[PDB]
Design an enzyme around this catalytic site. Structure first.
Site, PDB file in Angstrom:
ATOM      1  N   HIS A 162      30.765  34.298  37.425  1.00  0.00           N
ATOM      2  CA  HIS A 162      32.034  33.948  36.670  1.00  0.00           C
ATOM      3  C   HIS A 162      33.296  33.427  37.352  1.00  0.00           C
ATOM      4  CE1 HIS A 162      35.113  34.172  33.900  1.00  0.00           C
ATOM      5  NE2 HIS A 162      35.531  35.137  34.409  1.00  0.00           N
ATOM      6  N   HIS A 167      36.523  30.555  37.486  1.00  0.00           N
ATOM      7  CA  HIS A 167      38.110  30.321  38.037  1.00  0.00           C
ATOM      8  C   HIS A 167      38.357  29.707  39.325  1.00  0.00           C
ATOM      9  CE1 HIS A 167      39.644  33.509  35.417  1.00  0.00           C
ATOM     10  NE2 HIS A 167      38.526  34.046  35.484  1.00  0.00           N
ATOM     11  N   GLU A 207      41.152  32.072  30.604  1.00  0.00           N
ATOM     12  CA  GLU A 207      39.906  32.568  30.358  1.00  0.00           C
ATOM     13  C   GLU A 207      39.360  31.866  29.336  1.00  0.00           C
ATOM     14  OE1 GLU A 207      38.328  34.775  32.240  1.00  0.00           O
ATOM     15  OE2 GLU A 207      39.933  35.655  33.562  1.00  0.00           O
ATOM     16  N   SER A 226      31.914  29.844  32.404  1.00  0.00           N
ATOM     17  CA  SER A 226      30.653  30.424  33.136  1.00  0.00           C
ATOM     18  C   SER A 226      29.753  30.930  31.970  1.00  0.00           C
ATOM     19  CB  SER A 226      31.115  31.560  33.885  1.00  0.00           C
ATOM     20  OG  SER A 226      31.950  32.436  33.154  1.00  0.00           O
TER      21      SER A 226
HETATM   22  C1  LIG Z   1      44.348  40.623  31.600  1.00  0.00           C
HETATM   23  C2  LIG Z   1      42.979  41.468  31.015  1.00  0.00           C
HETATM   24  N1  LIG Z   1      42.458  42.174  32.420  1.00  0.00           N
HETATM   25  C3  LIG Z   1      42.995  43.234  32.704  1.00  0.00           C
HETATM   26  O1  LIG Z   1      43.630  43.920  31.793  1.00  0.00           O
HETATM   27  N2  LIG Z   1      42.353  43.929  33.622  1.00  0.00           N
HETATM   28  C4  LIG Z   1      41.380  43.508  34.412  1.00  0.00           C
HETATM   29  O2  LIG Z   1      40.884  43.898  35.456  1.00  0.00           O
HETATM   30  C5  LIG Z   1      41.001  42.085  34.232  1.00  0.00           C
HETATM   31  C6  LIG Z   1      41.573  41.343  33.010  1.00  0.00           C
HETATM   32  N3  LIG Z   1      41.040  40.202  32.993  1.00  0.00           N
HETATM   33  C7  LIG Z   1      40.170  39.804  34.130  1.00  0.00           C
HETATM   34  C8  LIG Z   1      39.357  38.711  34.146  1.00  0.00           C
HETATM   35  C9  LIG Z   1      38.368  38.465  33.427  1.00  0.00           C
HETATM   36  C10 LIG Z   1      37.701  39.439  32.402  1.00  0.00           C
HETATM   37  N4  LIG Z   1      36.691  38.804  31.609  1.00  0.00           N
HETATM   38  C11 LIG Z   1      35.803  38.821  30.815  1.00  0.00           C
HETATM   39  C12 LIG Z   1      34.813  38.209  30.447  1.00  0.00           C
HETATM   40  C13 LIG Z   1      33.770  37.961  29.485  1.00  0.00           C
HETATM   41  S1  LIG Z   1      35.386  36.530  31.407  1.00  0.00           S
HETATM   42  C14 LIG Z   1      36.654  37.548  32.284  1.00  0.00           C
HETATM   43  N5  LIG Z   1      37.553  37.276  33.249  1.00  0.00           N
HETATM   44  N6  LIG Z   1      40.041  41.021  34.587  1.00  0.00           N
HETATM   45  C15 LIG Z   1      39.548  41.396  35.992  1.00  0.00           C
HETATM   46  C16 LIG Z   1      38.315  42.368  35.749  1.00  0.00           C
HETATM   47  C17 LIG Z   1      37.237  42.149  34.999  1.00  0.00           C
HETATM   48  O3  LIG Z   1      36.364  42.452  36.271  1.00  0.00           O
HETATM   49  C18 LIG Z   1      37.862  42.678  36.987  1.00  0.00           C
HETATM   50 FE   LIG Z   2      37.681  35.621  34.279  1.00  0.00          FE
END
Ligand SMILES: CCn1c(=O)[nH]c(=O)c2c1nc(Cc1cn3cc(C)sc3n1)n2CC1COC1
Ligand SMILES: [Fe+3]
Length: 284
Positions: A162, A167, A207, A226
């Site tokens: 992903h 990204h 996202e 993804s």
């Molecule tokens: C702002 C919200 N948020 C948060 O609050 N904390 C995070 O850590 C965080 C986050 N958004 C992400 C990135 C993400 C989540 N997601 C789910 C899919 C389904 S696709 C995708 N991309 N992350 C990274 C963590 C996820 O693995 C580390």
């Molecule tokens: Fe992400």
């Protein structure tokens, strides 16, 4: 009082370490030990380190390959022009191939040259405040593990596939990097409510965002880029679409176990950036 926030890129050391049941690998100990291996690499990483390079297993590379081949069939008709522009550069300089998982360190060096973005390995989910705060320094917290091989299309948990396919190509685009950084900058020391709204705006752009290009709808959200089935669904007539509008978008619930109920369309990355600038004034 204003909450603690990072003031320089190395300050992320103090927050990046502040981190299922239906998961396909829940009953597999070998997978669990492997996931522990990746978590420890992230936990022990400190800013300034090269990101540890990993020898991925044959099973992991085939899982990547399966995801990579299907997604690439769709990108030419579904992804935005910025994504399509940057993707060939990643293949030539970072080893993006069906039979090779790119190393985060190589991708980080590529992004530092192109936009000043860099990667930091993250063991798991950080609070919204900590995750957004990395963007203020053009740091993207990145997972390094691979999804369980039993279901190569299992997407509700982000894995490295992903990160690398969803990204990274956009982080190499200046307009998108500026947009992303300004979400991070706006979040720094912001109220809890403001951080939630920025996190939701991030969710429905970075996202799951759609954009309008030459009168056509394209996809720029990493989560869609993804996810084979939702990538197709988002541009199908079955999806509900609304204009990106932060004061409205920030109220929308973020769904994890199903397709989104709605997708927001940004005119361009520059326009989404301008809209956020106006919005952040009212919440900070
Ligand atoms: C702002 C919200 N948020 C948060 O609050 N904390 C995070 O850590 C965080 C986050 N958004 C992400 C990135 C993400 C989540 N997601 C789910 C899919 C389904 S696709 C995708 N991309 N992350 C990274 C963590 C996820 O693995 C580390
Ligand atoms: Fe992400």
């Amino acid at each position: 009082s204003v909450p603690w926030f990072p003031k320089k890129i190395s300050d992320l050391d103090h927050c990046a370490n502040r981190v299922d049941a239906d998961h396909p690998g829940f009953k597999d100990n070998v997978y669990r030990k492997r996931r522990k291996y990746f978590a420890d690499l992230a936990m022990n990483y400190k800013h300034g380190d090269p990101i540890p390079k990993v020898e991925f297993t044959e099973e992991e590379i085939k899982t990547w390959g399966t995801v990579f081949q299907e997604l690439n069939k769709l990108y030419p008709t579904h992804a935005c022009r910025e994504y399509l522009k940057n993707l060939p550069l990643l293949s030539k300089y970072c080893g993006y191939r069906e039979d090779n998982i790119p190393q985060l360190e190589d991708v980080s060096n590529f992004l530092k040259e192109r936009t000043g973005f860099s990667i930091r390995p993250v063991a798991g989910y950080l609070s919204p405040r900590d995750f957004l705060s990395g963007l203020a320094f053009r740091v993207f917290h990145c997972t390094q593990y691979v999804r369980h091989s039993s279901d190569p299309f299992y997407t509700p948990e982000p894995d490295t596939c992903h990160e690398l396919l969803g990204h990274v190509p956009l982080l190499a685009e200046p307009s998108f990097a500026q947009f992303s950084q300004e979400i991070g900058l706006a979040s720094l020391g912001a109220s809890e409510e403001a951080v939630q709204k920025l996190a939701t705006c991030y969710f429905f752009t970075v996202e799951f965002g759609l954009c309008k290009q030459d009168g056509q709808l394209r996809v720029f959200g990493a989560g869609l880029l993804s996810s084979i089935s939702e990538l197709k669904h988002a541009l199908s007539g079955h999806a509900k679409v609304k204009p990106f509008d932060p004061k409205i978008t920030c109220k929308q619930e973020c769904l994890i176990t199903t397709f989104q109920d709605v997708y927001f369309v940004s005119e361009s990355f520059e326009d989404a950036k301008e809209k956020m600038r106006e919005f952040t004034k009212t919440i900070k």
